[PDB]
Amino acid sequence: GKIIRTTKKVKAHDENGEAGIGDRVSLMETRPLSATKRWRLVEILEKA
Amino acid sequence: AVKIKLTRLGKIRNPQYRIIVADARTRRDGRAIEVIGRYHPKEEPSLIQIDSERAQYWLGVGAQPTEPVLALLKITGDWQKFKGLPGAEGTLKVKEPKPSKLDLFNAALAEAE
Amino acid sequence: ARYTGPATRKSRRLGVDLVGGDQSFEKRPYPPGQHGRARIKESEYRQQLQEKQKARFSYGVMEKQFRRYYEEANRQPGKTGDNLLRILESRLDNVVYRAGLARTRRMARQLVSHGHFLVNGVKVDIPSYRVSQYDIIDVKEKSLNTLPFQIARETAGERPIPSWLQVVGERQRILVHQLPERAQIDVPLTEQLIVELYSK
Amino acid sequence: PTIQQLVRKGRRDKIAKVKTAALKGSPQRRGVCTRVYTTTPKKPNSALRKVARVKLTSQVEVTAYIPGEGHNLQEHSMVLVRGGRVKDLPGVRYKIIRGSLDTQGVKNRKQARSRYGAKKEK
Amino acid sequence: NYIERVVSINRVSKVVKGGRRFSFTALVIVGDGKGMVGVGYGKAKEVPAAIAKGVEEARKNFFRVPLIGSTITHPVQGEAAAGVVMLRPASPGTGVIAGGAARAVLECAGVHDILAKSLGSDNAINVVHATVAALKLLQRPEEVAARRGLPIEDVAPAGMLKARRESEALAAAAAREGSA
Amino acid sequence: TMTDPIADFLTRLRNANSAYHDEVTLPHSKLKANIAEILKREGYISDYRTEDARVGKSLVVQLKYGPSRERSIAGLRRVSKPGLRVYAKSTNLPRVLGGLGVAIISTSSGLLTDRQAARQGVGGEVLAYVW
RNA sequence: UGUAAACCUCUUUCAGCACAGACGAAGCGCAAGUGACGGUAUGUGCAGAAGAAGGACCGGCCAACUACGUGCCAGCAGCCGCGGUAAUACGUAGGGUCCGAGCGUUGUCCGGAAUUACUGGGCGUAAAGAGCUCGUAGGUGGUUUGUCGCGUUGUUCGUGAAAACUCA
RNA sequence: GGUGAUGGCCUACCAAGGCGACGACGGGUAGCCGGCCUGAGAGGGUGACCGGCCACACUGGGACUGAGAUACGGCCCAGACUCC
């Protein structure tokens, strides 16, 4: 019954090469764009 | 196709069917979609019951029932209704509701006294 | 399987009349055998077993049939002793006995086993047939020529008939009004011991 | 133990000792006796006890114990095996069922005939 | 009238230069079948003597029990030397469900429908002592409402009170059929 | 360090009840206050109040002993502890002593005993058992 | 032994013999017939107790005792363990008990086993605290205002195939 | 380019990147499930019947056909065994 925080990587997509590292993002799933590219960006969200 | 079938159930001597809308490429005691009725011929007045509305739905979407079920539908009037031939001519015979246990007991009492 | 051996034997084994009029029991109510007098290591298991052996040899049930009845009584929503005892007195041989057209439990078992009765329009050659409320056990045509049965219909002023039953006719037509309960029945040993046994 | 320990490692359980391994989950097996002889039990119980040394069809060579008081068994006889602990002996687990494929219901045993394989007097 | 028990007999032996000066023990439980419960560990060279000691010592050391008709109020953990017991109420018609020791205790006490379990210290001595500790940990809802000032309605649920009323009805019935 | 102030509260009351002390002293918090008010309602203790200290506030509790020195609180225990955060649906609420004793739930409607929470229909985090 | 028995009555189920003899098919056909199970199921009668009961166990857990034969033997056994002429424990008789068309045995699994303990366990001596510190990942986190409402909680919708299970 | 279709499914080129002590890469076993058995209940073992899915069809590969192929009772090849 204990709460478990867990980790999970994801591999996603931007058409225009915006986002740097150390950020917070919105996301949405899309039809697969490669092997292991499944999610896309919606809003590069909270700056760093 | 998407036909109307009967599935066999029960035990080895007396059957007690159900009425099914399922694909034709399935098996007899197989998966279903929407059971609608049933049929107990081992009884003499031979029970029949159908949800006529949903039956007419599956007849609308293009089902294609088999001979026996088609006969039952002609009886109950669902086929006659789907085709508007004269109209839903009700041919169904209902079982005789047999006497009530309480009335039997009380009548035997009053007969003895 | 109808047990056949002596009833006197077991009525002496546990030192109680299960038929009542047992003159050989009156003579030798103590147990039988070469060591019938000998002394006892007492225990609770002994009494708990003794209980059900008394019951099932009063009635005729075997252990497996009995255990099925017990599971049913515990499955029901009442409480186990009352439920079981009612379920168990519901049997047909016991019914006809307590109505009195049978002189003995064996005789009732036999008469049903040969199909002499007729329940609401179906032949019944079955002894463990239960009877719910509002059921009319008439007798068939040719129960006449049984001579002690004629004695029954004539002078069955023997052991009393209970309240939830009744007889109303010349062919001795039987009638049930309710299913009994424990305070109504008042038959041998109470059965918390038995419930505890199968609670083991 | 804490719950983080439990989630990180777990409750690894025991594994109990498989009894009667040669039979391979089978109740019996079939056997042929390479030897036939007798052997003495431990120091408290002073007697002389019967023994075989069987080649099973599960391909494991094992002793066996021989109930009753007679035995129709020499080497190469084909018998059948069942399992049973015998406290009197170090390394024995298996018994023999009497009345199967070579062995006979030892004689005059009128009580408990089912266990030894002898018939009823009519 | 009293109900009495004998639920343990071991054969003890002090040892001395001649040899073994044996002796006998006993554990005896007494109960009116209504709530009084007494316990005694009697011993002697003589088994009747030890039994009689246990009898009289149980009749000394009674203890009243918070009953409801035929069943306890609440479940409870009772600890003794190592005797653990998890008593718990039943629903009526269930039976006196326990082993040997606790069965003796509760059947003598008057219980008819109760659960139980031994979880440590299989010895009858400590088992009985733990059961007794549990019965002491029990509390009447009346005394609970007393100690915390509130009334029985806010202190208890409704089903227990149903049991109270129905058992008082059965009891008044029994007594008014007896005398009146 | 400190991690479980509610366990501090409860254990302190338990220790003081065993030592038969009269009044207790803590620092103060909204949650502790609501707990105390619920206990004062349910009947376990006589009274609480808020005095103060050098840097912050402080609670003071006034216990409840029998006239013959009968302790009013028998037992006491925290349930939903850090680590094992125990949550409760209305369908599966805890029953203490058949309902005599008291659970202490933390809900959208605030702290509530189990009965009040059930009558509202609500459920949520559990915090303690009392008897 | 044992009301067990003959004994005089009675009932005749189930099997047995003779006769009749189905529904299962508001169906299929536009022909005239249409049941593999099936001449069975099931009734009708017929003569009559006539054709019909074994298996395991008995020192204790574990309700069930004597005698006899053997007396470190043969042998038994799930554990405690029993046999050196007097055994209720071995094999046979009588007897009794438990079950009953089954009865015992073996094999495997769960249980009891709070004996991997989340509910439901411990670490001074019973087996168990690393030789002691530092600190990464991780875990956990004081008081208080506001905000998000992810966890959480309440309600309703969809779904959770049927059969299984449970209630009538 | 290809597919009924998205896709390194494939291809040329370009950058070198990805995975992992929350156990990858390796090893051993096993068909999954509704359910079944047990148990107070959590939970433990199980996957015979009945039903839904998946893989296979002497062993290993391959494709045509056609709306739809693991193509049992279809084809080609390769091998083991058998037969005229």
H-helix or E-strand spanning residue D83: strand D78-83
Whether the beta carbon of A16 falls within 7 A of nucleic chain H: the reply is no
Nearest to C36 by CA among C4, C14, C18: C14
H-helix or E-strand spanning residue D39: strand D29-39
Nucleotide whose C1' lies closest to the alpha carbon of residue B30: H51
Q: With beta carbons less than 8 A apart as the criterion, state whether D93 and D83 touch.
A: yes
Structure tokens at F75: 């037992």
User: Which residues have a Cβ under 8 Å from the Cβ of C37 and sit 6 or more positions away?
Assistant: C30, C31
Two domains, one topology: F1-73 and F74-131: no
- The CATH number of domain F74-131, selected from 3.30.1490.10, 1.10.3430.10, 3.30.1540.20, 1.10.10.60: 3.30.1490.10
Question: How far is A28 from D48, CA to CA, in rounded Å?
Answer: 84
Question: How far is B76 from B58, CA to CA, in rounded Å?
Answer: 16
Question: How far is C105 from C112, CA to CA, in rounded Å?
Answer: 11
Question: How far is D77 from D53, CA to CA, in rounded Å?
Answer: 11
Nearest to E107 by CA among E33, E28, E26: E33
Q: Where are the alpha helices (DSSP H) in chain B?
A: 52-60, 67-76, 78-83, 101-112
- Domain-wise residue ranges, chain D: 1-122
Question: How far is B62 from C54, CA to CA, in rounded Å?
Answer: 69
Nearest to C173 by CA among F28, F78, B104: B104
Structure tokens at D37: 């002889």
Helix (H, G, I), strand (E, B) or coil at C83: helix
- The CATH number of domain D1-122, selected from 3.10.20.30, 3.40.30.120, 2.40.50.140, 1.10.3720.10: 2.40.50.140
Nucleotide whose C1' lies closest to the alpha carbon of residue A7: H22
User: Which residues have a Cβ under 8 Å from the Cβ of C78 and sit 6 or more positions away?
Assistant: E93
Structure tokens at B8: 């066999």
User: Which residues have a Cβ under 8 Å from the Cβ of C21 and sit 6 or more positions away?
Assistant: none
Residues of E within 8 A of C195 (CB-CB) are 93-95
Chain F nearest C-alpha distance from D7 (Å): 11
Residue bearing tokens 């069943």? E71
Resolution of the deposited coordinates, in angstroms? 3.6
CB atoms closer than 10 angstroms to residue B87: 10
Task: Please compute Rg for chain B using Cα positions.
Answer: 19
The set of chains that have 3 or more CB pairs under 8 A with A is D, F
A37-46 and A12-13 as β-strands: parallel, antiparallel, unpaired?
Answer: parallel
Q: With beta carbons less than 8 A apart as the criterion, state whether E101 and E127 touch.
A: yes
> How many CA atoms lie within 13 Å of B1's alpha carbon, on the beta-carbon side?
11
User: Which residues have a Cβ under 8 Å from the Cβ of E129 and sit 6 or more positions away?
Assistant: E39, E80, E81, E83
Residue bearing tokens 């009542």? C20
Nearest to E35 by CA among E11, E3, E9, E77: E3
Exposed / middle / buried, residue C88 (Cβ in 10 Å: 0-12, 13-18, 19+): buried
CATH level 3 topology of F1-73: Ribosomal Protein S8; Chain: A, domain 1 (3.30.1370)
Nearest to C185 by CA among C160, C167, C168: C160
Query: Which residue of chain D is at minimal alpha-carbon distance from A4?
Result: D7
CA–C1' distance C6–G8 (Å)?
Answer: 21
Question: How far is E6 from E39, CA to CA, in rounded Å?
Answer: 11
Nearest to C7 by CA among C50, C57, C47, C64: C57
Residues of B within 8 A of C135 (CB-CB) are 101, 105
- Domain-wise residue ranges, chain F: 1-73, 74-131
Sign of the dihedral defined by the CA atoms of residues E71, E74, E79, E85, in that order: positive
Q: With beta carbons less than 8 A apart as the criterion, state whether D54 and D61 touch.
A: yes
Question: How far is B11 from B106, CA to CA, in rounded Å?
Answer: 37
Query: In which order are the strands placed within the sheet that holds F57-62?
Result: F23-26, F57-62, F47-52
H-helix or E-strand spanning residue A24: strand A24-34
Interchain contact, B101 vs C134, CB within 8 Å: yes
Residues of F within 8 A of E75 (CB-CB) are 97
Burial B8-36 (b: 16+ CB within 10 A, else e): eeeeeeeeebebbbbeeeeeeeeeeeeeb
Structure tokens at F104: 């202490």
φ/ψ of E122, rounded to 5, equals -55, -20
Residues in chain D whose Cβ is within 8 Å of chain F: 2-4
Helix (H, G, I), strand (E, B) or coil at B81: helix
Question: How far is D87 from D49, CA to CA, in rounded Å?
Answer: 12
Question: How far is E162 from D88, CA to CA, in rounded Å?
Answer: 63
Q: How many E×F Cβ pairs under 8 Å?
A: 35
Nucleotide whose C1' lies closest to the alpha carbon of residue F33: G143
Exposed / middle / buried, residue D2 (Cβ in 10 Å: 0-12, 13-18, 19+): exposed
Burial D36-68 (b: 16+ CB within 10 A, else e): beeeebeeeeeeeebbbebebeeeeebbbbbbb
Whether the beta carbon of B11 falls within 7 A of nucleic chain H: the reply is no
The set of chains that have 3 or more CB pairs under 8 A with E is C, F
Question: How far is D86 from D97, CA to CA, in rounded Å?
Answer: 15
Q: Three-state SS across chain F?
A: CCCCHHHHHHHHHHHHHHCCCCEEEECCCHHHHHHHHHHHHHCCCCEEEEEECCCCEEEEEECCECCCCCECCCCEEECCCCCCCCECCHHHCCCCHHHCCEEEEEECCEEEEHHHHHHHCCCCEEEEEEC
Backbone torsion region of residue C153, taken as left when φ is above 0, otherwise alpha when ψ lies between -120 and 50, otherwise beta? alpha
Per 3-state DSSP, what percentage of chain C is helix, strand, and coil (rounded to 5)? 45, 10, 45
Sign of the dihedral defined by the CA atoms of residues F6, F11, F17, F21, in that order: negative
Query: Using the 8-state DSSP alphabet, how is residue D81 labeled?
Result: E
User: Which residues have a Cβ under 8 Å from the Cβ of E153 and sit 6 or more positions away?
Assistant: none
User: Which residues have a Cβ under 8 Å from the Cβ of B94 and sit 6 or more positions away?
Assistant: B45
Nearest to C87 by CA among C182, C8, C154: C182
Q: With beta carbons less than 8 A apart as the criterion, state whether F103 and F128 touch.
A: yes
Exposed / middle / buried, residue A42 (Cβ in 10 Å: 0-12, 13-18, 19+): exposed
The secondary structure of chain E as a DSSP string is --EE------EEEEEETTEEEEEEEEEEEEE-SSS-EEEEEEEESSHHHHHHHHHHHHHHS-----EETTEESS-EEEESSS-EEEEEE--TTS-B---SHHHHHHHHHT--SEE--EEE--SHHHHHHHHHHHHHH---HHHHHHHT---HHHHS-HHHHHHHHHHHHHHHHHHHHHT-
Helix (H, G, I), strand (E, B) or coil at D30: strand
Helix (H, G, I), strand (E, B) or coil at D49: strand
Q: With beta carbons less than 8 A apart as the criterion, state whether D79 and D102 touch.
A: yes
| Residues counted in chain A | 48
Nucleotide whose C1' lies closest to the alpha carbon of residue F27: G143
Find the residue closest to G117 using CA and C1' atoms.
D11
> How many CA atoms lie within 13 Å of D94's alpha carbon, on the beta-carbon side?
26
Question: How far is B53 from B40, CA to CA, in rounded Å?
Answer: 21
Interchain contact, D3 vs A2, CB within 8 Å: yes
Q: With beta carbons less than 8 A apart as the criterion, state whether F124 and F112 touch.
A: no
Query: Using the 8-state DSSP alphabet, how is residue C143 labeled?
Result: G
Which whole-number Å values give the CA distances from E165 to C79, E12, E68, E169, E170, in the listed order?
Answer: 19, 50, 10, 6, 9
Widest CA span of chain D, in angstroms? Answer: 73
Helix axes C80-89, C192-199, angle to 10 degrees: 110
Question: How far is E146 from E141, CA to CA, in rounded Å?
Answer: 8
Beta bridge partners of B23: B2
Beta bridge partners of E39: E29
Q: With beta carbons less than 8 A apart as the criterion, state whether F47 and E122 touch.
A: no
Question: How far is E61 from D89, CA to CA, in rounded Å?
Answer: 53
Quote the distance between the C-alpha of residue E150 and its chain's center.
Answer: 29
Q: In the 141-160 stretch of chain C, whose C-beta falls under 7 Å of nucleic acid strand G?
A: 142, 145-147
Residues of A within 8 A of D5 (CB-CB) are none
Chain C nearest C-alpha distance from B102 (Å): 6
Burial F84-93 (b: 16+ CB within 10 A, else e): eeeebebeeb
H-helix or E-strand spanning residue D55: strand D49-56
Burial C119-140 (b: 16+ CB within 10 A, else e): beeeebeebebebeebbbbbbe
Angle at D11 between CA D5 and CA D12, to 5 degrees: 125
Q: In the 31-50 stretch of chain C, whose C-beta falls under 7 Å of nucleic acid strand G?
A: 32-36, 38, 40-41, 43, 45-46, 49
Structure tokens at F107: 């809900």
Backbone torsion region of residue E12, taken as left when φ is above 0, otherwise alpha when ψ lies between -120 and 50, otherwise beta? beta
Helix (H, G, I), strand (E, B) or coil at D93: coil
